[PDB]
């Protein structure tokens, strides 16, 4: 599986699921450049560490590639942005490991803070929580997705299960989902990518205590347009 100078090795015979049954298309409207050269290759985020105590991770798109890739150079120089994404979450484990990862895509993932006490008075979440870059951010309260929205029903979004007994990779293709044909890149995060433990990691002592979650993603039909800032 090679696209451009990037070469990744994965199974090309899995269960590829398309978000809400719709492939990323090019905008043929009036709201308005279509680069698929060095903005087409695979971007591979730094590996995360699936662990017993893990709560879960999320990534905000297209913020994850704002500074990290050449993709970013087109997103930070153009005041308009539109693109789909090919998400491929794969972890490498042994037959002696357990676990179950729910990889999902919830568009407009607004994060919420907390406010305990006899008088509730809270601020609004910081940029690191709102737009965590490619490093991502660990969930504070996973059962309510840090937004008072139960993960129990997360499967209504483009989802795939990663059962270390059964699966090893999860592939989600997400089209440009928005109320406008063209939106900002550094301001609006069209969606967030949730990867949350439902069945926790377990293993007899002596095994490698960290299972490597690897995220390889590439923008399917990137169309930035706008003009050069």
């Amino acid at each position: 599986l090679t696209i451009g100078n990037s070469t990744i090795t994965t199974q090309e015979a899995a269960n590829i699921i398309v978000g809400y049954g719709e492939w990323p298309s090019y905008c043929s409207d009036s709201d308005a450049t279509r680069p698929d050269v060095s903005v087409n290759r695979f971007y591979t985020l730094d590996t995360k560490l699936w662990e017993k105590s893990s709560k879960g991770w999320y990534w905000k798109f297209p913020d994850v590639l704002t500074e990290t890739g050449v993709f970013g150079q087109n997103a930070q120089f153009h005041y308009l942005y539109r693109s789909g994404f090919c998400i491929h979450v794969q972890c490498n484990a042994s037959k002696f490991h357990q676990g179950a990862l729910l990889v999902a895509v919830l568009p407009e993932y607004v994060i919420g803070t907390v406010a305990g006490g006899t008088g509730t008075e809270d601020s609004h979440p910081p940029y690191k929580q709102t737009q965590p870059g490619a490093d991502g951010f660990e969930l504070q309260h996973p059962y309510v997705l840090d937004a008072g929205i139960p993960i129990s029903q997360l499967t209504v979004c483009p989802h795939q299960w990663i059962n270390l007994r059964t699966n090893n990779c999860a592939t989600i293709i997400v089209p440009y989902i928005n109320a406008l044909p063209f939106d900002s890149a550094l301001n609006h995060c069209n969606f967030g990518l949730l990867v949350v433990p439902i069945s926790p990691l377990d293993y007899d002592q002596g095994a490698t205590p960290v299972i490597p979650i690897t995220i390889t993603l590439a923008p399917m039909c990137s169309e930035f347009a706008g003009l050069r800032q």
């Binding site: 407009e108 907390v114 509730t120 900002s184």
Partner: protein, 225 residues
């Protein structure tokens, strides 16, 4: 157990609910000016917020109704003016403001003896759909020097605002109470998301409590029912 029309988007939302009440007392601290401005809040009806937040993008018309009486429910010979102030135009500040006269702000002139005023508001958003959830910031600029309380804010869902007042140069003779009912008409919902788990803490953001709760935990043990 045969017809499925009961569970459509339309029949699920379409129902006139009490969405806000305007109070114009004879003398008090609330409205000593005999007028009030009510911004259109869909979350006026309690259960409606958790309802519409099942989806992310939505689009609808809205039919407003104005049941007006005294706090005793007595109907009195009083003339009322309900003015709609579109998102653009500014809201009236004084009772003698030139906002009450501006034509582009449509007005309704009814009597309490006349059956509740009924008008219909079209889809006002400049976007192709309403948006209860905005993971970002409205402005398309590098402005990042202030306190960013603009997170979750989406001033494109602004539906305008109604302006209730007692017609006439002199203050009204009767104590009035105007109740507002909104009914969603032609509705389309787009992206489904899980239904609210915890209690709502604020109005423009999905913040939650420092102590998380649960739907229900009746079973004292997994074994026994």
């Amino acid at each position: 157990s045969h017809s499925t029309a009961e569970t459509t988007l339309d029949s699920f939302f379409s129902r006139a609910g009490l969405v806000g009440e305007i109070d114009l007392p004879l003398e008090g601290t609330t409205n000593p000016n005999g007028y009030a401005n009510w911004d259109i809040d869909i979350t006026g009806y309690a259960q409606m917020r958790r309802k519409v937040e099942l989806f992310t993008y939505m689009r609808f018309d809205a039919e407003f109704t104005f049941v007006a009486c005294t706090p005793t429910g007595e109907v009195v010979p009083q003339l009322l003016q309900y003015m709609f102030v579109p998102p653009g135009a500014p809201k009236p500040d004084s009772r003698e403001s030139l906002a009450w006269q501006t034509a582009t702000n449509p007005s309704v002139f009814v009597k309490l003896s006349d059956p509740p005023a009924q008008v219909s508001v079209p889809f006002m958003s400049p976007a192709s759909a309403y948006q209860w959830f905005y993971d970002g910031y409205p402005t398309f600029g590098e402005h990042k020097q202030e306190k960013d309380l603009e997170y979750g804010a989406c001033p494109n869902n602004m539906m305008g605002t109604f302006s209730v007042r007692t017609v006439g140069t002199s203050k009204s003779k009767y104590p009035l109470v105007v109740r507002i009912y909104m009914r969603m008409k032609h509705v389309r919902a787009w992206i489904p998301r899980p239904m609210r788990n915890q209690n709502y803490l604020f109005k423009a953001n999905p913040n939650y409590a420092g102590n998380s709760i649960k739907p229900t935990g009746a079973s004292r043990t997994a074994i026994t029912t």
